[PDB]
């Protein structure tokens, strides 16, 4: 009826990161609350991507992905426990640094929302922070997700 | 709305790249 | 505008003609592009700033800019 | 014809935009980096803009052609449900 920029059947209401901060090797516990306006034929597909290098997309890691459905009308809540990244696939010079994770949702292969977070990685000991070992000691790395400042980018897709 | 009115002003219209016909 | 319009016009002309040389622009079309470009860069620097801050740094780096692009869903 | 008009975007212009974004200090490396990003953005939008132009059997890109192209970058907000 009314001309609108957003026509999405699904919209996010909030996301809680249950374990923050956490060890680098800890799974990501996302509590995702969203709203569904109409019945949908297909499921929702959530993906978590880790940016391994700021210099290119060549070191992106798809951490995990989950299919959620069938989706009931109204407000829904679920916990996405996503697998951690692989340290060995990340350039050693960029491992203990700030980076980005992308939580996206798509419908029938069409992405309609993308949530970006900043994530800092830091040693849990003052000595290691001042003097990083030649070999990265993963078990001493703590990640901190800036969960209060997400960048939510909405896209317009065709649904049903 | 005022920015929309002034949006086209300030460019070199002598340029053949620009067509304001 | 925060950028001089004549240098921006030359940049637009170059990029447009490198796509298809047989192509012209309205002055308001260039204006629309410039306002969008300037808004896009300002927003980018905001997230660039936020990146460095979360990194516990005070000065932004080339990597902060690239990460800011990723986080804005480009 | 002249080339490398991306160099026409000046250092103080880049600092100007950065300050508006709350960034007070930028190193020399930021300049070329910003220019690279700006060129990519302009390329992407102009591509989409022309698509709306050629579809309308025209050769002159209009302001509305740009607007339609802009409506495809997607809307980035801070926080949920905004
Ligand atoms: Cl949303
Ligand atoms: Cl860093
Ligand atoms: Cl550290
Ligand atoms: Cl936070
Ligand atoms: Cl000017
Ligand atoms: Cl300038
Ligand atoms: Cl860097
Ligand atoms: Cl200068």
């Amino acid at each position: 009826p009314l001309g609108s920029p957003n026509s999405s059947i699904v919209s996010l209401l909030g996301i809680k990161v249950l374990n923050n901060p956490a060890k680098f090797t800890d799974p990501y516990e996302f509590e995702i609350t969203f709203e569904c306006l109409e019945s949908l034929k297909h499921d929702l597909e959530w993906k978590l991507t880790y940016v391994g290098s700021s210099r290119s997309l060549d070191h992106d890691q798809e951490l995990d992905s989950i299919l959620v459905g069938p989706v009931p009308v109204g407000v829904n809540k679920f916990v996405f426990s996503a697998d951690p990244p692989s340290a060995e696939l990340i350039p050693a010079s960029e491992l203990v640094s700030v980076t980005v994770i992308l939580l996206s949702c798509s419908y029938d292969g069409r992405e309609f929302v993308r949530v970006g977070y900043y994530v800092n990685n830091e040693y849990d000991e003052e000595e290691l922070r001042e003097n990083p070992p030649a070999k990265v000691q993963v078990d001493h790395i703590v990640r901190n997700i800036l969960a209060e400042k997400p960048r939510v980018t909405r896209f317009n897709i065709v649904w049903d | 709305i005022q920015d929309l009115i002034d949006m086209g002003y300030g460019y070199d219209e002598s340029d053949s790249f620009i067509d304001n016909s | 505008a925060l950028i001089r319009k004549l240098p921006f016009q030359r940049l637009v002309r170059e990029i447009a003609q490198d796509f298809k040389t047989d192509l012209r622009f309205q002055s308001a079309a260039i204006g629309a592009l410039q306002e969008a470009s300037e808004a896009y860069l300002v927003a980018l620097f905001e997230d660039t700033n936020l990146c460095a801050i979360h990194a516990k740094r005070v000065t932004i780096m080339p990597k902060d800019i690239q990460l800011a692009r990723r986080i804005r869903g480009e | 014809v002249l080339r490398d008009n991306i160099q026409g975007i000046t250092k103080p212009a880049i600092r100007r935009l950065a300050r508006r974004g709350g960034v007070k200090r930028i190193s020399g490396l930021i300049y070329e980096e910003t220019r690279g990003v700006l060129k990519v953005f302009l390329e992407n939008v102009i591509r989409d803009a022309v698509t709306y132009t050629e579809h309308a059997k025209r050769k002159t890109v209009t302001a509305m052609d740009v607007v339609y192209a802009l409506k495809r970058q997607g809307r980035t907000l801070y926080g949920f449900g905004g």
Side-chain angles (χ1 to χ4, degrees), chain A, chain B, chain C, chain D residues 1-2 4-82:
Chain A
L2 273 62
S4 187
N6 189 339
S7 55
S8 291
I9 313 295
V10 179
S11 64
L12 272 44
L13 290 178
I15 296 178
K16 295 179 186 174
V17 180
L18 301 182
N19 56 330
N20 200 36
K23 295 172 60 63
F24 180 94
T25 61
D26 289 342
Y28 294 81
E29 308 293 336
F30 288 102
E31 189 196 75
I32 304 174
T33 300
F34 68 99
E35 184 183 6
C36 190
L37 297 179
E38 310 175 3
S39 295
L40 294 172
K41 294 176 180 177
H42 311 297
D43 296 344
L44 298 178
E45 187 181 15
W46 304 80
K47 296 176 184 174
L48 188 63
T49 310
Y50 193 97
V51 177
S53 174
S54 59
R55 289 179 288 101
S56 68
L57 275 68
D58 297 332
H59 299 275
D60 281 9
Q61 299 182 38
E62 180 171 328
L63 302 188
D64 209 337
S65 71
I66 186 178
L67 285 173
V68 170
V71 188
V73 179
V75 168
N76 301 320
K77 179 183 64 182
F78 74 104
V79 179
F80 185 16
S81 300
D83 269 19
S86 295
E88 66 279 7
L89 300 188
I90 302 173
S93 58
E94 302 192 66
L95 185 44
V96 200
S97 301
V98 70
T99 189
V100 165
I101 57 174
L102 295 164
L103 177 61
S104 66
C105 190
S106 61
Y107 184 82
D108 198 33
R110 300 182 294 278
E111 187 188 11
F112 60 92
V113 67
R114 175 173 292 193
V115 186
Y117 293 98
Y118 284 123
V119 188
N120 193 45
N121 296 280
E122 196 179 42
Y123 280 117
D124 61 351
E125 292 282 353
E126 179 67 33
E127 177 61 43
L128 301 181
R129 292 193 289 267
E130 293 182 58
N131 301 273
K135 170 180 169 60
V136 174
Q137 306 295 306
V138 186
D139 197 38
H140 283 275
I141 299 182
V142 176
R143 67 156 183 263
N144 191 316
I145 307 175
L146 189 52
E148 295 303 318
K149 311 281 186 56
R151 302 321 195 202
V152 185
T153 303
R154 299 186 193 236
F155 304 97
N156 282 322
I157 69 167
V158 178
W159 299 78
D160 290 337
Chain B
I1 184 59
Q2 188 55 43
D3 292 335
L4 179 53
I5 299 174
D6 309 337
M7 185 168 298
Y9 299 144
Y11 296 96
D12 181 33
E13 302 186 4
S14 167
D15 196 347
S16 57
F17 177 66
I18 292 186
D19 173 35
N20 285 336
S21 60
Chain C
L2 284 312
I3 302 183
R4 282 207 339 133
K5 297 189 174 182
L6 302 180
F8 192 86
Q9 177 177 339
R10 296 187 215 103
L11 178 56
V12 168
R13 180 177 68 253
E14 169 179 325
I15 296 182
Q17 288 170 344
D18 281 22
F19 186 28
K20 292 307 162 150
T21 34
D22 195 344
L23 193 67
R24 274 173 136 203
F25 271 59
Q26 291 180 334
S27 63
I30 307 181
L33 278 170
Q34 186 167 342
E35 292 189 8
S37 301
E38 290 182 10
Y40 165 77
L41 287 185
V42 167
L44 189 66
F45 277 117
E46 294 180 11
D47 292 334
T48 299
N49 200 36
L50 192 64
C51 186
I53 291 180
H54 195 62
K56 295 177 184 177
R57 279 183 280 104
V58 287
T59 305
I60 68 172
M61 295 170 170
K63 63 165 299 182
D64 296 320
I65 294 185
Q66 290 306 320
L67 289 179
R69 295 179 65 184
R70 302 303 309 274
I71 207 184
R72 289 190 74 83
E74 295 185 12
Chain D
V1 289
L2 299 216
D4 279 320
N5 288 279
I6 192 63
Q7 302 303 319
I9 308 304
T10 67
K11 298 183 183 177
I14 297 177
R15 294 196 301 271
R16 193 174 308 134
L17 295 164
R19 283 195 298 274
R20 182 55 171 81
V23 182
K24 292 118 153 203
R25 299 150 36 103
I26 63 174
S27 68
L29 289 174
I30 303 301
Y31 296 118
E32 277 305 304
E33 199 66 34
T34 305
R35 293 191 175 105
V37 177
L38 170 59
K39 187 178 176 183
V40 171
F41 174 85
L42 279 175
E43 285 171 349
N44 289 343
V45 177
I46 289 177
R47 296 301 190 278
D48 296 351
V50 173
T51 300
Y52 285 86
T53 303
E54 284 187 310
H55 178 267
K57 326 263 229 65
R58 286 178 288 107
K59 283 288 107 58
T60 298
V61 180
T62 72
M64 222 47 62
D65 298 30
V66 180
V67 174
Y68 290 151
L70 291 174
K71 293 181 179 177
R72 296 192 345 90
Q73 234 300 9
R75 301 176 165 264
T76 298
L77 245 193
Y78 303 165
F80 306 104

